[PDB]
Amino acid sequence: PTHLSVDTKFKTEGLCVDIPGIPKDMTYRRLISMMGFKMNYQVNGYPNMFITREEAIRHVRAWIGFDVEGCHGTNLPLQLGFSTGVNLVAVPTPLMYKGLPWNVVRIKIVQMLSDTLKNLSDRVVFVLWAHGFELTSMKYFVKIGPERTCCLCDRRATCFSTASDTYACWHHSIGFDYVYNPFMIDVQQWGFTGNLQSNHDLYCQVHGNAHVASCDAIMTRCLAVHECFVKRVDWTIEYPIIGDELKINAACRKVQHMVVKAALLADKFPVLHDIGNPKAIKCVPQADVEWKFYDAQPCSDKAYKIEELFYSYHSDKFTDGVCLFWNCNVDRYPANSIVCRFDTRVLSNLNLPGCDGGSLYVNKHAFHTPAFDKSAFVNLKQLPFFYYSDSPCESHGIDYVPLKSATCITRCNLGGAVCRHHANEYRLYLDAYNMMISAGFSLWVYKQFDTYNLWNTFT
């Protein structure tokens, strides 16, 4: 059962206001025919326009919420809303566009999906709360057939052009007019009581209902993200590499080792409380410190309450030494902390919009992360950039310009002139640091942290 069988039953109750008289007994096979499409017994990679919840979760990067509202149905204008915030008005003759015929609306749909999805996914998944008009509008901008490849590259085709009779992926679709072989899922098939707004609002206060199709589209996608990544979590599902995932993860390991090592050298904490991932490894294996681990999986809904992590009776004394929260998101960090906290507001191809201000960070696995909150860091300060090294000054083995920097904490800088090895290492470390920060990570530290305390570790 890899794909959704076309013979699966589709519940039609949510469609009967736009389509009165619709049969209660309905399959996807009959629904697709009703929508004006013909599948023609084709075993050519596209068995169904609709997909399972499991297939949708694997393709979360392709999710585009889509709603269609009657402005006044072949005789009336339709308002097409997308989770990108775009509203297009199509005439049968929060960005709002005036009424235009389908032949020009379809060109805009292809451009919008292509610009949104080219760096995210090889397809589009329209996330619906299906009431009828959205399904009956698909024939005006969607074409289906066998799975195809792009005319300018090896990627699967996502667009079709009636002008040249050619197919293209999202990267080569300029001037194309039809969406080709899209996928879709109706959230209303999962079992819900009441309307979209009532189900959405139970879990989210960030998306309002300004009474336009894009608002419904955003709410629909947000509800689907809630059901698949907030209430239900799956860290076994792997997502493909689309950007700087590897460099970011390597940079995070590099920065964690640097900051913790320097905090231990500078303040000589006798104990470190490492709170978070139950599979964590000591990030500074050679440190003298008593290293104590506390297990907590990533919180996907609300940030952990510090009172629940630390209290209810273990070292017990979390006030002794220092606490390390490396992506362990809590409501309020204690004053004696070293923290790495993901900023959900960051714009990136890895960070997708999420539920209630949270974001869906997709890097190898999907992590719904609670909304960034500046008040979590009230007992701490921002950690400044610095590079520390006690490794010997020796090159071994890329042309040079001498490094001058007050934040290169090395024996050679203490001595007055940074060596080639430490200049190369400082520049590689600065690039890794900038990669981590630009990915959305934020670093915070106990207020007494002072890099001036590292200079005397060179005796």
Ligand X SMILES: Cc1noc(C)c1C[C@@H](C)C(=O)N(C)C
Q: Cite the active site residues.
A: 67, 69, 134, 211, 216
Task: Write out the chain in H/E/C secondary structure.
Answer: CCCCCCCCECCCHHHCCCCCCCCCCCEHHHHHHHCCCCCCCCCCCCCCCECCHHHHHHCHHHEEEEEEEECCCCCCCEEEEECCCEEEEEECCCEECCCEEHHHHHHHHHHHHHHHHCCCCCCCEEEECCCCHHHHHHHHCEECCCCCECCCCCCECCEEECCCCEEECCCCCCCCCEEECCEEEEHHHHCCCCCHHHHHHCCCCCCCCCCCHHHHHHHHHHHHHHHHHHCCCCCCCCCCCCCCHHHHHHHHHHHHHHHHHHHHHHHCCCEEEEEECCCCCCCCCCCCCEEEEEECCCCCCCCECHHHHHCCCCCCCCCCCEEEEECCCECCCCCCEEEEEECCCCCCCCEEECCCCCEEEEECEEEEECCCCHHHHCCEEECCCCEECCCCCCCCCCCCCCCCCCCEECHHHHCCCCCHHHHHHHHHHHHHHHHHHHCCEEEEEECCCCHHHHHHHCC
412 is in an annotated binding site: yes
152's contact among ligand X, Zn ion, none, with CB below 5 to 8 A by partner kind, is Zn ion
Q: Does residue 287 contact residue 257 with C-beta atoms inside 8 Å?
A: no
The smaller minimum CB distance to ligand X, of residues 138 and 328, is found at 328
- Residue 358 near ligand X by CB under 6 A: no
327's contact among Zn ion, ligand X, none, with CB below 5 to 8 A by partner kind, is ligand X
- Residue 136 near ligand X by CB under 6 A: no
Footprint of ligand X on 171-210 (CB under 6 A): none
Q: Can you tell me which of 116, 363, 389, 410 binds ligand X, judged by CB under 6 A? A: 363
Footprint of ligand X on 317-356 (CB under 6 A): 327, 329, 342
The smaller minimum CB distance to Zn ion, of residues 201 and 267, is found at 201
352's contact among ligand X, Zn ion, none, with CB below 5 to 8 A by partner kind, is none
Tell the smallest beta-carbon distance from residue 169 to Zn ion (Å).
Answer: 4
Tell the smallest beta-carbon distance from residue 348 to ligand X (Å).
Answer: 11
The smaller minimum CB distance to Zn ion, of residues 273 and 421, is found at 421
Tell the smallest beta-carbon distance from residue 202 to Zn ion (Å).
Answer: 10
134 is in an annotated binding site: yes
Site string for Zn ion, 215-234 (x = CB under 5 A): -------x------------
Tell the smallest beta-carbon distance from residue 301 to ligand X (Å).
Answer: 12
- Residue 367 near ligand X by CB under 6 A: yes
- Residue 372 near ligand X by CB under 6 A: no
165 is in an annotated binding site: no
153 is in an annotated binding site: yes
Q: Can you tell me which of 14, 65, 298, 321 binds ligand X, judged by CB under 6 A? A: 298
- Residue 172 near Zn ion by CB under 5 A: yes
Q: Can you tell me which of 129, 361, 377, 387 binds ligand X, judged by CB under 6 A? A: 361
The smaller minimum CB distance to Zn ion, of residues 230 and 412, is found at 412
342 phi and psi angles, rounded to 5 deg: -70, 130
Q: Can you tell me which of 169, 213, 248, 436 binds Zn ion, judged by CB under 5 A? A: 169
Binding positions for S-adenosyl-L-methionine are: 274-280
Which residues of the chain form contacts with Zn ion (CB under 5 A)?
150, 152-153, 155, 169, 171-172, 204, 207, 222, 393, 410, 412, 419, 422
